[PDB]
């Protein structure tokens, strides 16, 4: 057994974190108390779930988690909410005034004054790990803390834990629930600085999740609660192999090995199915063929893009529920004849498949319906570069006028970091096009 530390930075990171840990506790039969009746080794263990949970002598199962935000409001809701005795107060770190949707303010101004304290509290979790494998970092691209502080943290984690893997779950900005007009700036900045320090990063466009919630859960105007509970399902499907017995993606290095052959192009596309409204009565259960065919619809992806106009260099299918290999391979055979699935010439056309027999857990009284089988496809496709093009265009429109740049220069950032960040993204867009056509 090898431990994984989760780190939650900013409002988005923190609030997505809560959704994730609530869901993990339900999946493992852990209570808000922290007690886990089914666990028979009291005071410790080397079970698969112990990758995410340490244990106390009183039998309390406690997340390998630190929550960091530069303002107390949201982390206070964790301190006083349903799962409050789950966490030790040294895991919940808060500042006084936030980064004001300013990368520079999060990275330089407040990042310098808070970074040593955060590495200290991360170090206190690493010390109680027998074989720490790495970090799962949750954050937004658009917030100042989420962008600015995260990129700094990642740079430091490379110094202090050079051999350890670092995975991201990054929230890509969308105008329908965005809170700032400079989110393109912040996204480009933190991506440029974090690129060398991230081994594999899962991008979730809030636009995609918002539309999935409208279209498939029949929600008129999705809140963050609606979004986060869907995000948590996708994150759980992805982390299940670390928390449960299995032989696919069982340590963080395997995510890189299986999904990321080029280090820079480390942004696999996630696609999830089925997403079914709970308040919908009479629902025809979708077959293995139908949910597996749904993994090639843009409308089920975490980022809206078109894999047909691009190339795959890796593809994992992660099933949860009543599924056997016979029906998966039959589904793939049909799908290959009906759809456009080009791999790059230097990779084999193929699929790594993991099945856990337990179907997805739902949050009780939630928006998602219980289902007999579900799947998350993790595909490294060049079509995700569309997301970079959109973001890079919005950047260019603002930056050509130097709009809002004074806010960043005012916190000590040089104007040249903008154009360095931008031309790094130009090179990334070029790397993707070179691989893809």
């Amino acid at each position: 057994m090898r431990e994984c530390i989760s780190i939650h930075v900013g409002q988005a990171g923190v609030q997505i974190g809560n959704a994730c840990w609530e869901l993990y506790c339900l999946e493992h039969g852990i209570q808000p108390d922290g007690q886990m009746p089914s666990d028979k080794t009291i005071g410790g263990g080397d079970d698969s779930f112990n990758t995410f949970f340490s244990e106390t002598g009183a039998g309390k199962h406690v997340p390998r988690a630190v929550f960091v935000d530069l303002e107390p409001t949201v982390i206070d809701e964790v301190r006083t909410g349903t799962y409050r005795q789950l966490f030790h107060p040294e895991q919940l770190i808060t500042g006084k005034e936030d980064a004001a949707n300013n990368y520079a303010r999060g990275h330089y101004t407040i990042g310098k004054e808070i970074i040593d304290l955060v590495l200290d509290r991360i170090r206190k979790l690493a010390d109680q790990c027998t074989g720490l494998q790495g970090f799962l970092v949750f954050h937004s691209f658009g917030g100042g803390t989420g962008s600015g502080f995260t990129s700094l943290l990642m740079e430091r984690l490379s110094v202090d834990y050079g051999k350890k893997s670092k995975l991201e779950f990054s929230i890509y900005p969308a105008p329908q629930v965005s809170t700032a007009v400079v989110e393109p700036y912040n996204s480009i900045l933190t991506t440029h600085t974090t690129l060398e320090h991230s081994d594999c990063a899962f991008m979730v466009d809030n636009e995609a999740i918002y539309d999935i919630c409208r279209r498939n859960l029949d929600i008129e105007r999705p809140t963050y609660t609606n979004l986060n509970r869907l995000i948590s399902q996708i994150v759980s499907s992805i982390t299940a192999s670390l928390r449960f017995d299995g032989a696919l993606n069982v340590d963080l290095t395997e995510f890189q090995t299986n999904l990321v052959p080029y280090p820079r192009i480390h942004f696999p596309l996630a696609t999830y199915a089925p997403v079914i409204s709970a308040e919908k009565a009479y629902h025809e259960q979708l077959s293995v063929a139908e949910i597996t065919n749904a993994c090639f619809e843009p409308a089920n992806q975490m980022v809206k893009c078109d894999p047909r106009h691009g190339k795959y260099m890796a593809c994992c299918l992660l099933y949860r529920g009543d599924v056997v290999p016979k029906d998966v391979n039959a589904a793939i055979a049909t799908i290959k004849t009906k759809r456009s699935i080009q791999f790059v010439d230097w990779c084999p056309t193929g699929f790594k498949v993991g099945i856990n027999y337990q179907p997805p857990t739902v949050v009780p009284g939630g928006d998602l319906a219980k289902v007999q089988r579900a799947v998350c496809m993790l595909s490294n496709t060049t079509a995700i570069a569309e997301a970079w093009a959109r973001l890079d265009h919005k950047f260019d429109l603002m930056y050509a006028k130097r709009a809002f740049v004074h806010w960043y220069v005012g916190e000590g950032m040089e104007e040249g970091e903008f154009s360095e960040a931008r031309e790094d993204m130009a090179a990334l867009e070029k790397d993707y096009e070179e691989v893809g056509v």
Partner: protein, 428 residues
């Protein structure tokens, strides 16, 4: 606890400031004595933004009342909410400023300013994490314009990394006949361009025209004008006072609204426009709020939005309504009127919804625009200013207090530069 320190200076500033405190105290269920008597925890969650909490369970506005004459502050003390304010936060002289910016800034105001700063300091020390300051004042008089700007300058020296926010009432010949108001206003705008982060341009031209034309009040009082100011001030501070996602503090608001540091003068709007006592029995639809809040007749600055382009916009809706319908309607406005929103700032309109409405309205909407059309307001002041200044008329009132013509020329230059700067980004 992200505290704002409020300052009100001069007749106008103290009058609109007093009305701000009446209105928000009522929305937060604070009575004239400071006691909470509300029926919702949403009123108290962010009460500390504007109120100190004293012993008992009493709430004292973090408010500093400043003037160079006693009249308006005796009126505020004698008024219904007057007992709510801390008595040591009334700082007043006896001389007056005689509607003279030089007297407020340099001579009469210089004598009182240190005792104001002591009260500001004491209020600031008591804050867990001060975010900044808001000032209410007119630019056309002496104390509010001259001393108000001096105070801004001094506060910036002591607190250079905090946000400075003003509610600045622009003079109009429809409301005042004092001949020297363009001088006072131009001098004050010179100060505001350098030393504020966010200024709400509340234009007496617009306030009067709304009262006369739309509200059909043929003899408007200052009270009728202020009724529109207090509603706007409630509206634009909602996001600071209630739990919310968008523009929750002064700095975030500034980062969303101000793409270049000098262009920080905002054009506020409000729907529905009401007069006091005349009841709105009919609640507005989300479509009507959205049409009206963007309408030229609902703007508190006398500027034609069609003569410019919006750099940034904050729209804030209040009451219980469909969020879906707000989104549709806001998206509808900017897609149907696409050419008025600069293409070089993507997604520059941000929308907030707060469940709690103002008193007497079920539905309301408050607009905050950084539009290049605000140049028309400055151009009007500039024309009035230049007409006098080219013959040096009424200038002895200012030179007699020690000022030089050079200051006037500099102020004129900086404001004319501001105007051309808006024109630059209007044609980009």
């Amino acid at each position: 606890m992200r505290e704002i320190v409020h300052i009100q200076a001069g007749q106008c500033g103290n009058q609109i400031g007093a009305k701000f405190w009446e209105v928000i105290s009522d929305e937060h269920g604070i009575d004239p004595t400071g006691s909470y008597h509300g029926d919702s925890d949403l009123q108290l969650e962010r009460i500390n933004v504007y109120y100190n909490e004293a012993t008992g369970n009493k709430y004292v506005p973090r408010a500093i009342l400043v003037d160079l004459e006693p009249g308006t502050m005796d009126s505020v003390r004698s008024g219904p909410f007057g007992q709510i304010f801390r008595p040591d936060n009334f700082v007043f002289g006896q001389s007056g400023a005689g509607n003279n910016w030089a007297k407020g800034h340099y001579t009469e105001g210089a004598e009182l300013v240190d005792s104001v700063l002591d009260v500001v300091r004491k209020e600031s020390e008591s804050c867990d994490c001060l975010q900044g300051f808001q000032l209410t004042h007119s630019l056309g008089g002496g104390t509010g314009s001259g001393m108000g700007t001096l105070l801004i300058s001094k506060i910036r020296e002591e607190y250079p990394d905090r946000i400075m926010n003003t509610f600045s009432v622009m003079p109009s010949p429809k409301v005042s006949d004092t001949v020297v108001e363009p001088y006072n206003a131009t001098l004050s705008v010179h100060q505001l361009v350098e030393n504020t982060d966010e200024t709400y341009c509340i234009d007496n031209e617009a306030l009067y025209d709304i009262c006369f034309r739309t509200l059909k009040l043929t003899t408007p009082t200052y009270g009728d004008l202020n009724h529109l100011v207090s509603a706007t001030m409630s509206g634009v501070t909602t996001c600071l006072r209630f739990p919310g996602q968008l523009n929750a503090d002064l700095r975030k608001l500034a980062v969303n609204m101000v793409p270049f540091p000098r262009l920080h003068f905002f054009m506020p709007g409000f729907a529905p426009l009401t007069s006091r006592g005349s009841q709105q029995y009919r609640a507005l639809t989300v479509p009507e709020l959205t049409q009206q809040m963007f309408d030229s007749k609902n703007m508190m600055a006398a500027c034609d939005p069609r003569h410019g382009r919006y750099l940034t916009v904050a729209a804030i809706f209040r009451g219980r309504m469909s969020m879906k319908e707000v989104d549709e309607q806001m998206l509808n406005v900017q897609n149907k009127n696409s050419s008025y929103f600069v293409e070089w700032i993507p997604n520059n309109v941000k929308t907030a919804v707060c469940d709690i409405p103002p008193r007497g309205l079920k539905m309301s909407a408050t607009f905050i625009g950084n539009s290049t059309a605000i140049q028309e307001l400055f151009k009007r002041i500039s024309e009035q200013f230049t007409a006098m200044f080219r013959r040096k008329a009424f200038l002895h009132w200012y030179t007699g207090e020690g000022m030089d013509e050079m200051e006037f020329t500099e102020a004129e230059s900086n404001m004319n530069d501001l105007v051309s700067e808006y024109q630059q980004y209007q044609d980009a």
